[PDB]
């Protein structure tokens, strides 16, 4: 009906809550919001990998599903009137990105380094038609070229090179608040602390830096240092180079989710570390055990149902295991009644 406007703020959340003719081989599943509610997107094998999106709760069956675009890396979100999807298809050295708007292709973007073009593999954020998308091309264990592409009505308005102090950017998760978008993701090459990118679609610009929190949120990682730095990356850990995650940052209303093990993708916990944006000596408060150390975890992402009938946005998250869990709660406070 009307283009979405990021005006409602992000109020405090205390404790997380449970929200989550056959199934296909679904891998890399994320969640995307729309005026009708929330849907789950996943890549399925049917050489012909395709995205399939289904309603919350319902099992993936060939009666309530719809394909967005064809590829192996992808992203998608909504702007209030239409849904914008991006997929990457083609050979590894000649990858091309196809953009779909209201179910038909509208734009093709070619590669610029020719070494596996990839996207954020999560949801995107749309503000008054401007929908930033972060893409990367090049080595996954060295310097790579990262660009930010701004879409509107399925058309390009600006492609700009990455700025700031970020060194490696892959598979990012973005959330919008107060008109500004914050994207948190993986440093696959050197750092063990996640970078953060601030995007302003008003002035049509972005800036990049790191997280100042001393609580590292990547796997693998070393023991948490005394003074987490947000200008230069912190290197360590073995053998895993990194894992996709997320982080909500609203000063005192901050949440960081990380695997239990410092070397393996086992378990999942969260911490309310106050002032995750700037504080270097910050320490966590509210703990909540989401996934125990016994079973395996995977890629974790963040999504917000901006079209809620509330004065807030009520952020939410998902963690993979295989199956996955989508969780988010309210001001109700932690206790023996929470899981």
């Amino acid at each position: 009906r009307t283009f979405l406007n990021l005006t409602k703020p992000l109020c405090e959340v205390n404790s997380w809550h449970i929200l989550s003719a056959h199934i296909l081989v679904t891998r890399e599943p994320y969640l995307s919001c729309d005026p009708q509610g929330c849907r789950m997107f996943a890549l399925s094998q049917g050489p012909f990998r395709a995205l399939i999106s289904w309603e919350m709760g319902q099992a993936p069956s060939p009666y309530n599903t719809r394909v967005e675009c064809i590829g192996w890396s992808s992203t998608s979100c909504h702007d209030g009137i239409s849904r914008m999807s991006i997929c990457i298809s083609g050979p590894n050295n000649n990858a091309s990105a196809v953009v779909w708007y209201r179910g038909r292709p509208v734009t093709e973007i070619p590669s610029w380094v020719g070494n596996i073009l990839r996207t954020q593999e999560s949801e995107c954020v749309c503000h008054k038609g401007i929908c930033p998308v972060v893409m990367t091309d090049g080595p996954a264990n060295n310097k790579a070229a990262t660009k930010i592409i701004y879409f509107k009505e399925g058309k390009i308005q600006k492609i700009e090179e990455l700025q700031g102090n970020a060194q490696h950017i892959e598979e990012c998760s973005c959330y919008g608040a107060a008109g500004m978008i914050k994207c948190v993701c993986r440093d696959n090459w050197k750092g063990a602390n996640r970078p953060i990118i601030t995007i302003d679609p008003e002035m049509m610009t972005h800036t990049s830096k790191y997280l100042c929190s001393k609580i590292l949120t990547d796997t693998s990682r070393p023991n948490d240092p005394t003074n987490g730095n947000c200008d230069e990356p912190i290197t360590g850990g073995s053998p895993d180079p990194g894992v996709k995650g997320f982080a909500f940052l609203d000063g005192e209303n901050s949440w960081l989710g990380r695997t239990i093990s410092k070397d393996s993708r086992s378990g999942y916990e969260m911490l309310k570390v106050p002032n995750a944006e700037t504080d270097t000596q910050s320490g966590p408060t509210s703990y909540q055990l989401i996934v125990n150390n016994q079973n395996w975890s995977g890629y974790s992402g963040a999504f917000i149902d901006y079209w809620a009938n509330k004065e807030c946005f009520n952020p939410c998250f998902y963690v993979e295991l295989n199956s996955m869990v989508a969780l988010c709660g309210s001001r109700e406070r932690l206790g023996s009644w929470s899981w």
Partner: antibody
Amino acid sequence: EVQLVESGGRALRPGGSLRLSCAASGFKFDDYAMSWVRQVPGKGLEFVSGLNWNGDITAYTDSVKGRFTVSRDNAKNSLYLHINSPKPEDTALYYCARTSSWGDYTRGPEPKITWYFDLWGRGTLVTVSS
Amino acid sequence: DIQLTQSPSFLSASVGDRITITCRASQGIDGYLAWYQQRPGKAPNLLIYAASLLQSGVPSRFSGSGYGTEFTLTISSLQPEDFATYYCQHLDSYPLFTFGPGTKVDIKR
């Protein structure tokens, strides 16, 4: 410009120890992998060993797995290959090669080591005879 | 355990002629293959990587193609500097980075 200089290679006797040194100049030392590739004076090139920027991942071939040492010193910007317990099959010319990666996008926890060589050097001779 | 045999072993061709070389593997290796040129008594230099991408400094008369078990390299026009040996290297063979046996090209008699 880009330059790799090899030194320390010489003929030696079985049961000895040798050290081969590689000096790099003209590029970012700590943002690239480095490897050694050997070639007998009659046949083609053969891979022996290599490593990444921080030394976390090291590769040795089957025939030198138990008798080769590979290290790098970024403070001195140098690469060192130590050969112990030589055999008469290790008479060849060694090249120090700057190594990069292509198609290393792995979703799972295990890193993918796909390597190709771009910059080479003059090489040093290593002959093992009784 | 991936084989790598390249043909022809020896080939004599005049200057400025169509010359192509084929590297073959036992099983499909995707685009994980590179080509190296080594002049007589010179250090080898990388020509193409990923079976289609040219290096920054190499001339534009070297072309590569292929996806699977067969890879082809073609020199657009032979040059006096083009008399050398050629090797095909596999990439995803940790830690046995296989090289080709070697193809040598000389002046036709």
